[PDB]
Amino acid sequence: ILTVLEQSQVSPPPDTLGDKSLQLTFFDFFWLRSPPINNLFFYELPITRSQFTETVVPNIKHSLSITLKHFYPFVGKLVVYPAPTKKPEICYVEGDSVAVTFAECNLDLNELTGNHPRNCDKFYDLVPILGESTRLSDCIKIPLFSVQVTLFPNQGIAIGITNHHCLGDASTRFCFLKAWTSIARSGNNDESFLANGTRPLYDRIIKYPMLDEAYLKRAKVESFNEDYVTQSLAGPSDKLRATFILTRAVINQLKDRVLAQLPTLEYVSSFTVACAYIWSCIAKSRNDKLQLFGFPIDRRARMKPPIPTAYFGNCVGGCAAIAKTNLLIGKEGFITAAKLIGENLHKTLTDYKDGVLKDNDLVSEGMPTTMTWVSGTPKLRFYDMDFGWGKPKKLETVSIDHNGAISINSCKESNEDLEIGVCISATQMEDFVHIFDDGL
Secondary structure: OEEEEEEEEEOOOOOOOOOEEEEOOHHHHOOOOOOOEEEEEEEEOOOOHHHHHHHHHHHHHHHHHHHHHHOHHHHOEEEEOOOOOOOOEEEEOOOOOEEEEEEEEOOOHHHOOOOOOEEHHHHHHHOOOOOOOEEOOOOEEEEOEEEEEEEEOOOEEEEEEEEOHHHOOHHHHHHHHHHHHHHHHOOOOOHHHHHHOOOOEOOOOOOOHHHHHHHHHHOOOOOHHHHOOOOOOOOOOOEEEEEEEEOHHHHHHHHHHHHHHOOOOOOOOHHHHHHHHHHHHHHHHHOOOEEEEEEEEEOHHHOOOOOOOOEOOOOEEEEEEEEEHHHOOHHHHHHHHHHHHHHHHHHHHHHHHOOOOOOOHHHHHOOOOEEEEEEOOOOOOHHHOOOOOOOOOEEEEHHHHHOOEEEEEEOOOOOOOEEEEEEEEHHHHHHHHHHHHHHO
């Protein structure tokens, strides 16, 4: 359904990069045991098999190769040592390559790029496995980045990108993809990138070794080698994937509702209101007991002192809210959700300002019967990633299927609209669609 056309390995150009390391911080160590991240970029273009083979295949290989010489960790590996004392790091060694799979899919592309419920498992063989680990005497090596480029004959192309979270955050991914696409768009040339582009900063400017040591202990690095197993998504499943739109106009209406009912709520944004609304739908859909809802925060600009945008690696925080489900249901529920999110976010941002870096409580206070964590930052415009065929028709974060997660991104006919991706069982999707639509 699924035909593998080529299994390739792509390296930086000959004689450009030597052996290189990148040292990691607690921001990176926090992700040691995370599952891989899987992202899809769908493009519409009337491409034949012969054309795909003739120009697309060599173009992908060539442009990625060039990009890799500026982004060495993308072709490196995560190396974790059993010694409690030798810290994990990213190592690139000459000879290291990125696995790039070229494939062909016989599904109708129009059945995948829509926003209505589609089987979550139809997407798994569009995203590459992270890749097998290398086990040596002194250490384990884990691939950080893999790619699949899938032809939909006469219809278009899906680019599947799988990465390890230790490689970097959304911002790092964004920086890489800007460079790669620029290099691609401009005919496999890094001239325009070197002149006008944003280059990664590898300077190790986050220096908190006591935090480093504490985060590693938490992520149990001593048993990592023995514990670590691959975590690829595989069907079959009854779950359905859908995309929900919150337009600028609807967001502003919801926001006015919040500001009018809660005139002294200290934090209200498009994003908190969107979260509030979807949180409320999830509460009505589950009809459970107690819920947690949270999302990541890019901390670069809130660090003391601030961290340049171009900083390579993770610099992410998070904010969470917990409420009884009964309090989150209905028109009033959305208001309560917005209140709680806004208060917790205000507190979290206040903490960062004061320089606070850190942050089984639930066994005591109460176990949530639903936990939801947002994958995504609407601020980063992945919808503009153009390899030369134009902007993507559809983005999907496929790794939300693994756990309590939804995706939130900007749209991209409009950067002020929001797209929310959900993968849930078929029984719940029916009601969820009505809940989301009717509440608007």
